[PDB]
Design a protein around this nucleic acid. Sequence first.
DNA 1: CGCCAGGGC
DNA 2: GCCCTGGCG
Lengths: 293, 290
Amino acid sequence: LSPGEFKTLISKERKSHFITPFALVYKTFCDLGYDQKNSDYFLNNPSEYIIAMRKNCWKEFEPFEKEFTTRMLSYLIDEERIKDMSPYDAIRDFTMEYPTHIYDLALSNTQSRRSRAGKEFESILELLMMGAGIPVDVQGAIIGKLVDLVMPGVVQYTSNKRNTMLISAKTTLRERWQEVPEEVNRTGIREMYLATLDDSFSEETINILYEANVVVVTTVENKNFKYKNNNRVLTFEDMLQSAMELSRKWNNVSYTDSEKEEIQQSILKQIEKYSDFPYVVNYYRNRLSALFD
Amino acid sequence: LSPGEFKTLISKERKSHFITPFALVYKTFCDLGYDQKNSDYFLNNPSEYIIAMRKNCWKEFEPFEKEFTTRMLSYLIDEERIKDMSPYDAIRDFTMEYPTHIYDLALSNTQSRRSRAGKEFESILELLMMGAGIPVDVQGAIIGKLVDLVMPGVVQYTSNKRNTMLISAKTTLRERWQEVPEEVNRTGIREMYLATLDDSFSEETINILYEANVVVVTTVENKNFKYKNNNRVLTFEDMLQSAMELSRKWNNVSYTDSEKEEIQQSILKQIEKYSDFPYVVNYYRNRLSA
DNA sequence: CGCCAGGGC
DNA sequence: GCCCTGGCG
């Protein structure tokens, strides 16, 4: 009933009532039929896939968040307080009595939305690479924690970063793009792709990132609308082509017995992470099977 | 009516109803009585000053924010929609009818608080240096934009980065500390101070910052409470002593013809910016007459 | 353009 | 430990 206890309640209810960002992305991926599309589809249509995935995730989330918000706000309506108030004075009281509650709820909502938007964007990209058939290790499933996807895998990367691809994602950049050169420079990363839906980043940012060997990747629509001229801004289609070309380099490479068991271990860990997601397990198990192929 | 007409209203109403972060910090600086403290107070007790400033700025805003929201929400109340509704039913209606309007207002508020919190933290630090009598340029009153304070000034820094100090500030770090090595490395900065009140940053972060020549500075309270043994964490007290030592090297310097002209121009800009603030203006006038 | 009185995941 | 369905200053 206090602003404090209401936070704990919002917390408890959120966790109960919302599936994980990745579970939502996976649900949506299968619902939109992407789980039956061949790898060429993802290779050829990554920008449209991303936007459709984004659109549907939000379409499903937003009526649900609205009702969760309405419901939260209802664990604090006080029928006994508001006995003989007029409807106007009733609403008046509400806007006066529970400012920290209302605000804390909306605060918890935005903080969830921010965390989830990033996590779902990463998950969307992750499934994109999987759908494309491209060997990746997912950061949060197995190099700074800022990298989301390591192609073909951390084991191979750790051995030698040649012919690899590292992809990070930020739905919008603000000044937070500055984090990426920091991480690139901290670990000696050769280059990083920085996937974004941001329509507003500047040329000065692009050039600083360029100097730091961070490549911005966005949708064709965003690129053609806002960065048409600009060969420093890539599309997801460019990226996916690059990833596809580099993945042919990992195709029938023979690992030493030692690296092979490390790759297996890494894949096994990720299958574990993605235990409840047949499409992803299947994706990893093909990679596992590829080592004995 | 529409959120697009209510968010345009939220912004109109905020601009109209709240004084700027600096002005709040300045009001607070002077209310606490800091405009009467000698330079040695600021030099010797920077953490006490910062803590007390942060304490009170919040108090002289927290109640106020609370009421601003209430006023804003009263513009959603539709007398004709709700007349003859049960009061409880009018509340259910309200919590079902405008919860975007309600989110949009609390979102705008937190976005205000975050922005104001950093800008007030910078302002608190800037008046700490002014209070201490230390020559600084205030980056946003005329080196990355991330740097708030350049001691003794950007003209001299540009002449030679030796004997200078750059201070940046983040109320909390999260992963955003990563911006600072980026900025240090991008411009060849020797070292930067990162002022923070964050009590939760890890050893890894401290070590990464350290390698990057970013010096983390926090209150003596936070240091002794969270980082007591770690000598890579400085206190504002350590920082102020360092700023003080460097400032001497500048006060019996003699500039050439051309540099003094850039400097007074730099100051000129900052007297213009803080025109409406006597204590700060006083600060720059003395600087200008040398 | 930077801030993050910043909780969620 | 990173996210920023992120507007404000």
